Design goal:
This is part of a larger assembly, with 3 copies of chain A and 1 copy of chain B. Chain A is an all-alpha fold. Chain A contains 3 helices and no strands. Chain B is 42% helix and 22% strand. In chain B, a hairpin with a 2-residue loop joins strand 2 and strand 3. Chain B is extended. Classes of the chains: A mainly alpha, B alpha+beta. Chains in contact: A-B, A-C, B-C. Chains A and B meet through helix 2 of A and helix 1 of B.
Amino acid sequence: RTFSQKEMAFNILGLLTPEIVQLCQEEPVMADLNGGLQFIDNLKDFTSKL
Amino acid sequence: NNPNELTIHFGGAKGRAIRDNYIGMMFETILKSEKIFKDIDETTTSYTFVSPTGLLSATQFTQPALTLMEKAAYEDIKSK
Amino acid sequence: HRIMLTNLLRLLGAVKSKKPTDTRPAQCILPLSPNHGTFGFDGLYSESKI
Amino acid sequence: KKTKDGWEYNKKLSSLYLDGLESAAINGLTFKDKYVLVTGAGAGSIGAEI
């Protein structure tokens, strides 16, 4: 899937939650907000094809 | 400095330990066990002390400061 | 690249230098990318993101 | 070898590289007609031995 600016902002603002804040305090947080794009083989070629 | 305001922050492990100290502080009376800092809990990230003109006049900070100035003067006197 | 990486690290370092307190960390929301060079001609964008 | 995501150890490529190393160890390695540009090859460095 592909996000809107509002959706991405909601995701990051949730990443600014108190729970993720303390999580970052105790341990660096890697938040994959990619909408499943990592599972596409040859993303550049597929994008150019589309 | 005698700051008018002073915010203690509870971020990181040291912050959690300090918050635990503040939470464990209890005002036992006759047996009731009301907490000194009722507004501090596990979900609080900070606590602010409030004074009208300066925190050095506050009882919690005045007493340690005065006890300590007297102790330090007496210990320098002892060293002499 | 300077904007995206070097001055970013300098901003974080300046905040750290300004903080003598150790109990109020600043949460740095790094805009990481899932695509480090897989897409086409982007200059040093992928370099900075990785 | 790069999988459909990241880089993981590969048996075939590793065996090829180690076989090349074995060949270089026994018979030596010719670099004739190889035009190289090496930097950071001062005395007491890996580049100097290269």
